[PDB]
């Protein structure tokens, strides 16, 4: 019993964290085999950030300008190249603690664990989701740039995020491990803002099925809804449109509890209309959207209470 | 910016998790040097233990089988002397925590870690964790510099879904026993010093709507706290909140006048740090550490 926001064990990622210094800037790098991956803005000054020309800044650098530190040992840089918004530093030593890994690009609504670092030293781990507006509601301070997001399934680490910057509203933006940003953001000090954020509907539904499994049904009603009428109402509360793909994904949770997806959609409609009336669902007074259908099946028991 | 329930990096603990089997029961063990620590219920415990021999206990570390060469009991924990010392043994201490203090939990099944999460020791000595069957032997810890301080070992789940366990010396937290009997958690209270610390974290993050010009005596606040099922706030708690009061410029008894107003009138449709409830699982030290950047 119990339902917590759970992160993956961080050990396989801790062994890849290094410190990168270029001039006066210091941030984090990911050391996998004989390559260190980090944000390309490590080559920029604060002034350069208004309109940086990365190709012109990189051409003026040599390998010995980049200092890479792994614990107490200094790694020697023997090459450098750029791939989108990531800098790849070829080093003379391969990482002996390199785990089995993949670089994957996630879609909005997908969750992941974040290992927050400062000076190539891990300080904490937490779970979060890629928001519909492509931002992350994380917890980051200055020096955290280059911290990474990941999922672990079996003995394989799937790297999905690298932290690049914080926006005026306190939210965070970054790239996949190939240097392509999530969202319409640039690694430039520009007047860019996060778009209006919406609630991840498929995730709220999954979390309602988790409440049923753990033994709670007070929020259920005797009504059903068409998929179209549900989206007409939910759009009015800033909820993401629910697609037929989302319905298909919720299939096993619907089968395990005996509650059809469009019947769970009717409880959500009523919950939005009435509020909680002093009650909680799984210890929360708000409707939770940072747990995917896959996370609910992974964490919750296979036997309903 | 941002405020999340953060756990310590679990790597140093992952390298100590092993699987223990005795008869039909299978649970988790902590391998430190040449000893494996696990709940004694894996087996009148003294009389049950005397019958057993070393070869009855099967210890598995990853793919390798460890051979048991001795066994002894300490309170509610079983200590299995193994023939191999753990090469990944970190620098460690066994510490007993007090109610209100927080810690990270590495949840395991079959000696294999599956997740990490942060939680607090409640005033009623239970933990609101997330555990399934096979999680027995999962451990709680904190990290200070490079030293792992083990504070909890999971033993059982209670009828209300909450969890109970011991320190690493086998002494339970709370009035619980390791056996199938009628045991219930006592009435729980809110950790007042922790709610106040979380309100200071909201002012550091630009949330100030709940602030006011009023102050209160510590005695007038404890009478309001007694009515709302909140733990009594002591002078020690006031002293502990000193650096957060100095950093924000808001005196502790001014922050108590804000908590008094939130306990009577509620939030009025508003949230604090993305929450509609008052949060009590962040200590004053956790607030200072998350709003500073201490690394390990
Ligand atoms: C907001 N202030 C003043 C902080 O000290 C702060 C606070 C928190 C921070 C969290 N993450 C990153 C940080 N910094 C940057 O975004 C660095 C940067 C600047 C401009 C463009 C790019 Cl692509 C990168 C953080 C910085
Ligand atoms: Cl995805």
Residue in chain A closest to B2 (alpha carbons) equals A139
Distance from CA of B286 to the nearest CA of A (A): 11
Residue in chain B closest to A295 (alpha carbons) equals B115
Report which of A164, A176, A38, A10 is spatially closest to residue A102, judged by C-alpha positions: A176
CA distance A53 to A76: 26
Look up tokens 């209160």; give the residue: B216
With an 8 Å Cβ cutoff, are A8 and B293 in contact? Answer: no
Same fold, A1-14+100-197 and A15-99: yes
Domain ranges of chain B: 1-14+91-188, 15-90, 189-292
CA distance B17 to B15: 6
DSSP string over A82-101: EETTEEEEEESS--TTPPEE
Report which of A199, A202, A201, A208 is spatially closest to residue A282, judged by C-alpha positions: A208
Report which of A270, A274, A273, A268 is spatially closest to residue A288, judged by C-alpha positions: A268
Query: A150 C-alpha vs ligand 2 centroid, how far in Å?
Result: 12
What fold, for A198-301? main proteinase (3clpro) structure, domain 3 (1.10.1840)
Domain A1-14+100-197 part of CATH 2.40.10.10:
yes
The widest CA-to-CA distance across chain A, in whole angstroms, is 70
Report which of A36, A49, A42 is spatially closest to residue A22, judged by C-alpha positions: A42
Atom of ligand 1 nearest to the CA of A187: 23
Residue with CA nearest ligand 1 atom 8: A141
Look up tokens 């106040």; give the residue: B196
| Sign, Cα dihedral of B240, B243, B244, B248 | positive
Structure tokens at A234: 């939910």
What's the CA dihedral at A207, A6, B289, A21 to 10 degrees? -110
Please give the interface size between A and B, counted as residue pairs whose CB atoms are below 8 Å apart. 123
The widest CA-to-CA distance across chain B, in whole angstroms, is 70
Which CA distances in Å does A16 have to A31, A119, A123? 5, 13, 14
Tell me phi and psi for residue B287, to 5 degrees: -65, -45
Q: Does B237 qualify as catalytic in the annotation? A: no
Query: B29 C-alpha vs ligand 1 centroid, how far in Å?
Result: 42
Give the active site residue among B16, B38, B41, B154: B41
A227 exposure class (CB count in 10 Å sphere: 0-12, 13-18, 19+): middle
Report which of A209, A205, A195 is spatially closest to residue A131, judged by C-alpha positions: A195
CA distance B99 to A7: 24
Contact A66, A20 (CB under 8 A): yes
Please enumerate in sequence order all residues whose Cβ is within 8 A of that of B26, keeping only pairs 6 or more positions apart, or say none. B19, B20, B110, B134
Is the beta carbon of A269 within 6 A of some atom in ligand 1? Answer: no
CA distance A288 to A220: 17
Tell me phi and psi for residue A37, to 5 degrees: -105, 130
Query: B112 C-alpha vs ligand 2 centroid, how far in Å?
Result: 25
With an 8 Å Cβ cutoff, are B116 and A10 in contact? Answer: yes
CA distance A169 to A111: 21
Contact B150, B140 (CB under 8 A): yes
Specify the resolution in Å.
2.0
Q: Are strands A66-70 and B68-74 parallel, antiparallel or unpaired?
A: unpaired
Q: Does B291 qualify as catalytic in the annotation? A: no
DSSP string over chain B: -----PBPP-HHHHTTEEEEEETTEEEEEEEETTEEEEEGGG--HHHHHHH--GGGEEEEETTEEEPEEEEEEETTEEEEEESS--TTPPSEEE-PPPTT-EEEEEEEETTEEEEEEEEE--TTS-B-----TT-TT-EEEEEETTEEEEEEEEEEE-TTS-EEEE-TTSPBSSS--SSSS---PPPP-B-HHHHHHHHHHHHHTT--TT--S----HHHHHHHHHHTTBPPPPHHHHHHTHHHHHHHT--HHHHHHHHHHHHHH--TT--BTTBSS---S--HHHHHHHTTT---
Please enumerate in sequence order all residues whose Cβ is within 8 A of that of B128, keeping only pairs 6 or more positions apart, or say none. A2, A283, B119, B122, B162, B163
Q: Are strands B64-66 and B68-74 parallel, antiparallel or unpaired?
A: unpaired
What's the CA dihedral at A219, A223, A224, A225 to 10 degrees? -100
Domain A15-99 part of CATH 2.40.10.10:
yes
DSSP string over chain A: -----PBPP-HHHHTTEEEEEETTEEEEEEEETTEEEEEGGGG--TGGGGS--HHHHHHT--GGGEEEEETTEEEPEEEEEEETTEEEEEESS--TTPPEEEE-PPPTT-EEEEEEEETTEEEEEEEEE--TTS-B-----TT-TT-EEEEEETTEEEEEEEEEEE-TTS-EEEE-TTSPBSSS--SS--S--PPPP-B-HHHHHHHHHHHHHTT--TT--S----HHHHHHHHHTTTBPPPPHHHHHHTHHHHHHHT--HHHHHHHHHHHHHH--TT--BTTBSS---S--HHHHHHHS-SS--
Gaps in chain B after residue (C–N beyond 2.5 Å): 43
Q: Which residues of A touch B (CB under 8 A)?
A: 1-11, 14-15, 115-119, 121-126, 128, 137-141, 143-144, 166, 170-172, 214, 280, 283-286, 299, 301
Cα A217 from chain centroid?
30
Report which of B137, B129, B138 is spatially closest to residue B158, judged by C-alpha positions: B129
Structure tokens at B81: 């002397």
Query: A160 C-alpha vs ligand 2 centroid, how far in Å?
Result: 9
CATH match for B1-14+91-188 among 2.40.10.10, 1.25.10.10, 3.40.50.1370, 3.30.930.10: 2.40.10.10
Report which of A80, A73, A65 is spatially closest to residue A19, judged by C-alpha positions: A73
CA distance B184 to B197: 30
**Which of B130, B157, B290 is the closest to A139 by Cβ?**
B290
Contact B118, B127 (CB under 8 A): no
CA angle at residue A46 from A40 to A47, to 5 degrees? 110
Other CB atoms within 10 A of residue A267 CB: 21
Is the beta carbon of A46 within 6 A of some atom in ligand 1? Answer: no
Look up tokens 């048991």; give the residue: B68
CATH number corresponding to B15-90 = 2.40.10.10
CA distance B29 to B39: 8
Residue with CA nearest ligand 1 atom 18: A165
Structure tokens at B119: 């939680």
Q: Are strands B35-39 and B25-32 parallel, antiparallel or unpaired?
A: antiparallel
Long-range Cβ contact pairs of B65-71 (< 8 A, separation 24 or more): B66/B18, B66/B31, B66/B36, B68/B36
* Nearest ligand for residue A110 CA: 2
Atom of ligand 1 nearest to the CA of A165: 16
Give CATH superfamily name and number for B189-292.
main proteinase (3clpro) structure, domain 3 (1.10.1840.10)
Residue with CA nearest ligand 1 atom 26: A142
Report which of A86, A43, A83 is spatially closest to residue A62, judged by C-alpha positions: A43
What Rg do the C-alpha atoms of chain A give, in angstroms? 22
């Amino acid at each position: 019993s119990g339902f917590r926001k759970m992160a993956f064990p961080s050990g396989k990622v801790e062994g890849c964290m290094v410190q990168v210094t270029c001039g006066t800037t210091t941030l984090n790098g990911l050391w996998l085999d004989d390559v260190v991956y980090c944000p390309r803005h490590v080559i920029c000054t604060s002034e350069d950030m208004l309109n940086p020309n990365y190709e012109d800044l990189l051409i003026r650098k040599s390998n010995h300008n980049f200092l890479v530190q792994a614990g107490n040992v200094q790694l020697r840089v023997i090459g450098h190249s750029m791939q989108n918004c990531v800098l790849k530093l070829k080093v003379d030593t391969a990482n002996p603690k390199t785990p089995k890994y993949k670089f994957v690009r996630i879609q909005p609504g997908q969750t992941f664990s974040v290992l927050a670092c400062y000076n190539g030293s891990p300080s904490g781990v937490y779970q979060c989701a890629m928001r519909p507006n492509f931002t992350i509601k994380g917890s980051f301070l200055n020096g955290s740039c280059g911290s990474v997001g990941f999922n672990i399934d079996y003995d394989c680490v799937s790297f999905c995020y690298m932290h690049h910057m914080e926006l005026p509203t306190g939210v965070h933006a970054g790239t996949d491990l190939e240097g392509n940003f999530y969202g319409p953001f640039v690694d430039r000090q520009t007047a860019q803002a996060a778009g209006t954020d919406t609630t991840i509907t498929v995730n709220v539904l999954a979390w309602l099925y988790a409440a049923v499994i753990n033994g709670d049904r007070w929020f259920l009603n005797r009504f059903t809804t068409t998929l179209n009428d549900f989206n007409l109402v939910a759009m009015k509360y800033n909820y993401e449109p629910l697609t037929q793909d989302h319905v298909d994904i919720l299939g096993p949770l619907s089968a395990q509890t005996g509650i059809a997806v469009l019947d769970m959609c009717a409880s959500l409609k009523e919950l939005l209309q009435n509020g909680m009336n002093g009650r909680t669902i799984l210890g929360s007074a708000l409707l939770e959207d940072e747990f995917t259908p896959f996370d609910v099946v992974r964490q919750c028991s296979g036997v309903t209470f």
